[PDB]
């Protein structure tokens, strides 16, 4: 299985435009991740990972993005905050695992890494597994803003500015979210 294509990738996606890769037509052995980074968190929800070698799943989705360390707790079923509500939402029925590790050596830059952004304003919360890459102005006031930012109308995206001088809470963390799906279609990912 193309686990390396997701984990050892050069650049990860911003959390607001998060990446999804469908895993199929392969055997899912995780020895790779076991021989991967010293992990910050390996949080599985609704599934024993000690049973992830006898899996027999049809489709497995590898969601990947970058956030700060403070926000890794938000990547969980039934959480709240800017990331969980505006950028990446997991369902309360989530059947998968969240793998995260400090990426400060790859994603932090000298004057801040302003290529990683996240969504700060949204009128309603995302539905689970929804993706909003819109860049349109936000209306915090009652002035109708005809595509123009300003006094009470905001641009909805904000860069992280990852710097090596930040503490681990604000340092970049790469997150891979494996969603284990069970449909009637025969097994395409096994162990």
């Amino acid at each position, epitope marked *: 299985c193309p686990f390396d294509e997701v984990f050892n990738a050069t650049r990860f996606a911003s959390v607001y435009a998060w990446n999804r890769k469908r895993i199929s037509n392969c055997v899912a052995d995780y020895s790779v991740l076991y021989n991967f980074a010293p992990f910050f968190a390996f949080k599985c929800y609704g599934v024993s990972p000690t049973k992830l070698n006898d899996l027999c799943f049809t489709n497995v989705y590898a969601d990947s993005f970058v956030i700060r360390g403070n926000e890794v707790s938000q990547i969980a079923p039934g959480q709240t905050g800017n990331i969980a509500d505006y950028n990446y939402k997991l369902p309360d029925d989530f059947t998968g695992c969240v793998i995260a590790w400090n990426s400060n050596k790859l994603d932090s830059k000298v004057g801040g890494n302003y290529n990683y952004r996240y969504r700060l304003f949204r009128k309603s919360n995302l539905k689970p597994f929804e993706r909003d890459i819109s860049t349109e102005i936000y209306q915090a006031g009652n002035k109708p803003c005809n595509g123009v930012a300003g006094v009470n109308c905001y641009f909805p995206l904000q860069s992280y500015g990852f*710097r090596p001088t930040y503490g681990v809470g604000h340092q970049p963390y790469r997150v891979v979210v494996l969603s284990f799906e069970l449909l009637h279609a025969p097994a395409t990912v096994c162990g």
Partner: single-chain antibody
Amino acid sequence: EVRLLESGGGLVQPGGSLRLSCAASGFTFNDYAMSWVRQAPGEGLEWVSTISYSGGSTYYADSVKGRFTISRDNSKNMLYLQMNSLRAEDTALYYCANGVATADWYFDLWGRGTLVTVSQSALTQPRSVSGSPGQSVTISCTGTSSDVGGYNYVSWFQHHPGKAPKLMIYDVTDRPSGVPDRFSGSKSGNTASLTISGLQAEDAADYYCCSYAGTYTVFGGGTKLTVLA
């Protein structure tokens, strides 16, 4: 493959002006910070200036602040240094460097250097250490709480005046590609330490510690390592 090439050095009168250029090749130039490091004849390595990957962040050394201007053209894969009010103490071989293989704040890739002729507060190292072939030597580097004791972004460089320095240790303890396990590093508080074991004749060189502190990069005074045949 990956290459940096300096150019634009020459003879200029004191108080004159010169512009240096650095040509990148083999990597995504606009993803990485670029830095200028110089070596003045008889002097140790000195960090001159660092530009961020975008260009909206410039950092300078107090010894040059106000007189040089660093810039980059990401469309042309070029880094530039505008040196004005050139003094005699600016006579040096100038190098451009980035951290393409380690991290954005290190110097692992270097150019060959360009020669500029115009007509301390460094980290404290021993000036000289000697050792016999096959033995081991330890070289110490003592800085303040704002550099070596602030972060763990310490580096160790091998250097021969007249050629670019080579990164030997980064992140206190790690070796880049091609560096033998005979070189190893450690840190305790404000002091870092490089140990060279199994000394060979070619290990004789100058050794500099280095520290990145956010707003600046600072080199040690350098330790000449003589390997007595």
